Each structure stands twice: as C-alpha cells, then as structure tokens.
Amino acid sequence: SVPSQKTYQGSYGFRLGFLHSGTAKSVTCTYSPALNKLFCQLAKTCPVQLWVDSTPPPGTRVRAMAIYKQSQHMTEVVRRCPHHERCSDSDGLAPPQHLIRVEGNLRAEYLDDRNTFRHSVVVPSEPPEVGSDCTTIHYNYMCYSSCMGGMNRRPILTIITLEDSSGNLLGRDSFEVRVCACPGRDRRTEEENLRK
Numbered sequence: 001s002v003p004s005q006k007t008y009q010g011s012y013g014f015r016l017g018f019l020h021s022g023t024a025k026s027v028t029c030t031y032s033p034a035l036n037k038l039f040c041q042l043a044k045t046c047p048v049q050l051w052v053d054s055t056p057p058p059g060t061r062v063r064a065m066a067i068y069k070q071s072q073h074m075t076e077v078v079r080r081c082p083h084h085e086r087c088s089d090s091d092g093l094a095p096p097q098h099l100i101r102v103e104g105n106l107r108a109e110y111l112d113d114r115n116t117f118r119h120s121v122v123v124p125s126e127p128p129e130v131g132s133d134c135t136t137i138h139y140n141y142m143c144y145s146s147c148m149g150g151m152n153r154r155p156i157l158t159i160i161t162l163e164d165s166s167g168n169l170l171g172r173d174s175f176e177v178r179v180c181a182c183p184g185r186d187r188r189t190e191e192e193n194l195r196k
C-alpha cells in the first residue's frame, strides 16, 4: 500500500547526484542538499545523476515513482490534477495522468500498477557516455505542488529504484520535490527557515 523509501545502496553502490544550479530568480531547477529537496518549475528539465561503484548487469532498469510525504496522505496515489490530466500535452508516450515523465528516452515505459494503481516511469540503465563519470536521466514534473484537486500543496517524494530485469530491488534513493513558479526563491526561503 505504501512503497518503501529506505535508502539502500545495494551491491552496486547505487545513489543519486544533483547539479549545483544556484538560487537565482531565473533558475528552473535547483537541488537543496540540506533539505534533500529538488525545486523545479512546471514541465522543465530536471537532471538527476545516477552513480554506481560497479557495473550492473545488462537489463538493469531505473524506475521513478512519486508518493506523498505526509503520513496521513501516503496511501493516496500521486497523480496529475483534474486540469492537467486533460490539457492534451502528451508526448506520445506518457499517459496524461502521470506526474513524472522521462524526457528524450524512447525506451521509457510507463506503468500503471494493476494492484496499487500507482504510476511509475522506468528506463534501461545505461553506462555513462564516453568522457563522463555518471549517467543522467532528465525528468519532468507535470503539475504544480499547489494544483487544486491534485497535489493541493501537499509535499511529495520521488523514489528512484535500481531494479533487475524482473523488477527486483537492487538499490534505492529518494528526494523531496516542490514544483513551483520560483524554485530559486523558494529554495532560499526553505533553507533560511531550516537554519532559523
């Protein structure tokens, strides 16, 4: 009923990484290590790095799923709001209900769980491009945290799982997400609040 969010590096040493994008008013996506929280604008590119200490097998996959952070809402499926699920902004692959999309990966697959009704998007694990030290997946979040009838200002977490070809767990990481109009300003505010 509630997927695990326990960090788990597993046998391959799996974990996420994030760019250092700053907090200027014009930034479209920025990650706060002190809050373990990503702030991004609606439907904008969010680069998420994948790191491992050793090479996983061919057919390893990487899945992303959103859940509500608060206890009283964890059982509710995170989905796009009644407006955005009907705004015909499909990319041809992502179902219009899904909050999380993968940008620019034709091997992305979108799951509606037959049992939990939860949504997820999964791509094959790939080695870094020649000359890079990690692999990057580009995610888009397709509703605002504030969207009425949808997330309705409730905070969410993204859970990233490394999986084998059967879907068995190999590694797990997670981060909070706020989809908002001004990520740089809101990251500065929430970090100030944390210190105060």
Ligand SMILES: CCn1c2ccc(CNC)cc2c2ccc(-c3cscn3)cc21
Residues within 6 Å of the ligand: 050, 051, 052, 053, 054, 055, 056, 057, 058, 059, 060, 125, 126, 127, 128, 132, 133, 134, 135
């Ligand atoms: C998880 C992304 N990633 C890395 C990230 C980071 C690194 C470390 N670079 C210093 C290596 C890999 C890596 C190697 C192989 C595969 C792979 C082969 S067949 C399927 N997936 C994937 C890899």
Ligand SMILES: [Zn+2]
Residues within 6 Å of the ligand: 080, 081, 082, 083, 084, 085, 142, 143, 144, 147, 150
């Ligand atoms: Zn919405």
